Amino acid sequence: SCGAELEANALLTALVAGEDFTLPDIDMSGSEYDIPGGINSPIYAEIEK
């Protein structure tokens, strides 16, 4: 195998060092990103003429 993956990891760590790149940590399933009601909300009720 010769560990091509190890060489790639070491090279990437050495070449980009000296800077900070931190991705955001939002969790998009926390119920703050959903429309409030389920099927029971009046959005899904039939509209009368």
Binding site: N40, A45, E46, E48
Partner: protein, 49 residues
């Protein structure tokens, strides 16, 4: 396979059908609510296929 069941009548989402595929009753005008009670032998009832 059970003998502990409940019958729930919800006046929202009243769908008229054998398989609940039909027009929906308007809850805002209802005159009476009569439960249909029959026997097992009512009109070739139980064992027809």
């Amino acid at each position: 396979g059970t003998k502990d069941y409940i019958f729930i009548l919800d006046f929202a989402d009243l769908r008229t059908g054998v398989a609940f595929n039909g027009v929906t009753i308007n809850p805002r005008n209802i005159t009476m609510i009569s439960f249909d009670c029959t026997e097992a032998h009512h009109g070739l009832g139980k064992d027809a296929y």
